[PDB]
Amino acid sequence: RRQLIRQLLERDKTPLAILFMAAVVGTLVGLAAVAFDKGVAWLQNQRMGALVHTADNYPLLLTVAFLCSAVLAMFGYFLVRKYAPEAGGSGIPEIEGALEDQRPVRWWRVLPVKFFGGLGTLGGGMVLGRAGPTVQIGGNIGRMVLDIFRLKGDEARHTLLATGAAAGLAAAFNAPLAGILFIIEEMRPQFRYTLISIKAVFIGVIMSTIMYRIFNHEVALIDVGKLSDAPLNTLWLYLILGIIFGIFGPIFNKWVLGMQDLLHRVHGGNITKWVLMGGAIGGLCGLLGFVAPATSGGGFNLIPIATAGNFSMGMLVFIFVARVITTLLCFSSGAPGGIFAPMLALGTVLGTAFGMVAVELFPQYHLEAGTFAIAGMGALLAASIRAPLTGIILVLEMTDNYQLILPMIITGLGATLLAQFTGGKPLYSAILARTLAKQEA
Amino acid sequence: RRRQLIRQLLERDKTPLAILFMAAVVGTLVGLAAVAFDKGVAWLQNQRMGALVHTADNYPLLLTVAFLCSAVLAMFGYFLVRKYAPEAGGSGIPEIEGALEDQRPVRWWRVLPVKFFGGLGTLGGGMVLGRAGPTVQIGGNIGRMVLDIFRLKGDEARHTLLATGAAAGLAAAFNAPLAGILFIIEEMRPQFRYTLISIKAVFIGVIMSTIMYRIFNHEVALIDVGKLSDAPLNTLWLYLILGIIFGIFGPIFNKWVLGMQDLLHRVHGGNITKWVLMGGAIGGLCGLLGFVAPATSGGGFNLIPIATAGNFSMGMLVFIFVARVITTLLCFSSGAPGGIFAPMLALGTVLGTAFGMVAVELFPQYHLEAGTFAIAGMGALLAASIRAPLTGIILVLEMTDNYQLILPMIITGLGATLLAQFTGGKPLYSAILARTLAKQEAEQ
């Protein structure tokens, strides 16, 4: 009790050095995040102009689509396998480990590798996101300034590393809240106390977000408009949807883990077969990125279309099935790029699909399938990555439909609950475990 | 400790099913309780209105039964606390916060009726106090109640059910589910050590209580502000200034509520009679003010949409702010059952609006709307005095639905905390628990 009384009176006094440095960490991460985003776009853009150059000869056209993405993919697979192996996959499990002081933060290597390697895989039009990359980039940047300014202590090492990855997520989704929430729901040391200053994470998240706003304002990543409200006698439909996500979550989790194994056998661990396999996958995506764009790329483009109920039921099933395939191929291959974002598109489609059935089964509820897309958007997050509070707040920050806060919270919680009860695990924790154990195996 | 981590990682997020289910019942009960409390406070304020109409002619006689009705109700509240449950005085949040540190008892058999009925008197009487604190403590106790009844053993259960209760308690008091969950993991939880509080379980309880509120309060928002204008990047610097202003006022306000506790204590010395009498004096003052200047009394939720819409004059805003500083301190520092959380929303809204008024006229090139500054400042006095900015922001967001102001809100709140820290201020709920906890081993 005596200690507590002392501690209470000393609560919320973060070292000003840690606060000021958090501001610079955020700023750099923001700018870096912007530069990454502009870069990816530029490359996808050039590929488009190349397809126009040869818009006539379909075979030739179907070739340079493959090659441009193949070459770009290989360049990314190489930069990872050669200079920074830790920069494979999302990057979140890695930074998560670094917070437990169980993985190293080699910023001198990861920063250029992830930035340029990711620039290739993403820009090639592979099914990967910016979230993971920017989060790892964010942490390394946070690590970088810690080193440069020689800030000593556990608090500083844990804080600056945290604000960086937070400000990294924020600047990748224009979601400041979701960024801060992700650090304290998933990223932080989950099994012990930590000296991460929340006030400091805030400051970093602000600056990076502000940086994003200077280069991206007036345009939202996802525009959905304002949808209809959700009656109380309609809420049970959302609990059901969450249950469906809840049982598919772990299954999808087994696949991404298992497909890592299968894809490993193809190259054995060899830098040549791996990069070659990489160009094969990347080439496939660039090909799909022309013959069926919905089956490739980030997937942010089909989200508003799905929510507006413009896809037919058949097209939705196609897109979902196809994108399960092309997501696993791209992420389980070890290519630099997160799976966080592509799960938004997966959830949105599964949600809309559910809404379509809900619309015709109960005309008395006067439903709109779009409300189920929004409920399902962060559901696969809630089910597979198991961070529902972050997913919900993220989806809210991106869709601005707060009147669906109850359906969203219900669907998400129904996802996590059923994921737990069917023996699934947090993917980022199940991956860090994979790596950490393999390290002492 | 790598080997342990690998084990722990693969065992992450597996909350005991008993704890999960029990969280669902805790949420439900807390919700129904919160609704009942809300309906009760309203009904009493309503009867008081009908009495003033009975005597709407004779102004002195009218100015009397306004005083008496509130005086009587106040005393009944001050009495129930001072006689059966002294821990039910004040907000109730520092107490539950203590119970999470296993440093304060949760006497639900006493607090539940005392807080519910005692707060029903102070709130219903028209005193300047909130529902948040009360429902939070009520929620915690209800959580504790089902723990005992079902004999659930373990630290996890004791900490979880106690947490989901106070979370689902805040949620049902503001119709703000996100804000409730966030308040537990930003402020309520044990701040200096690890804890076994299942977040998934706090979620379930928060859902149920919120849903319970939705069955009895749908279609009507606690605060309607409408959609306001956006905030340009070159205007953001105005919000950082606003935060700084909240940031230096926060601690000062904190000194007052603490200090006024001392001063008001001397009036009664600790005696149950002078105290209850002093209560009726304060309560009667509010019921009087609740008729001759209603903006200086009551919760304050009513003047929030009006201020945001820029319908008050600058002079009125200054008057309301000054007066409400006075009536808030008198009501909360007196130890009456009732929180200070919610009345800090009204104080912040006014101070914010006031800033916007000056901002509108100083920079017409920004094409400003003072309403955006009220919303920025609404959860700012929270951020500065209670030092829980992430909660206040998400709360204000949930109540006002103006997400395009998220950057100004975040900037103003963070500016409030930063300047609060740098000017030697302390979290009020932690500074109060400390006051109590130390006093507990100071009488030794």
From Swiss-Prot, chain B:
Keyword Membrane in record: yes
Transmembrane segments: 17-53, 61-84, 108-125, 132-150, 199-216, 237-265, 272-293, 314-333, 339-360, 406-422
UniProt gene name: clcA
Name of the protein in question: H(+)/Cl(-) exchange transporter ClcA
Intramembrane region(s): 93-100, 161-173, 177-185, 371-385, 386-388, 389-400, 401-405
UniProt topological domain (Cytoplasmic) ranges: 101-107, 151-160, 186-198, 266-271, 423-444
Similarity comment: Belongs to the chloride channel (TC 2.A.49) family. ClcA subfamily.
Pfam families, sorted: Voltage_CLC (PF00654)
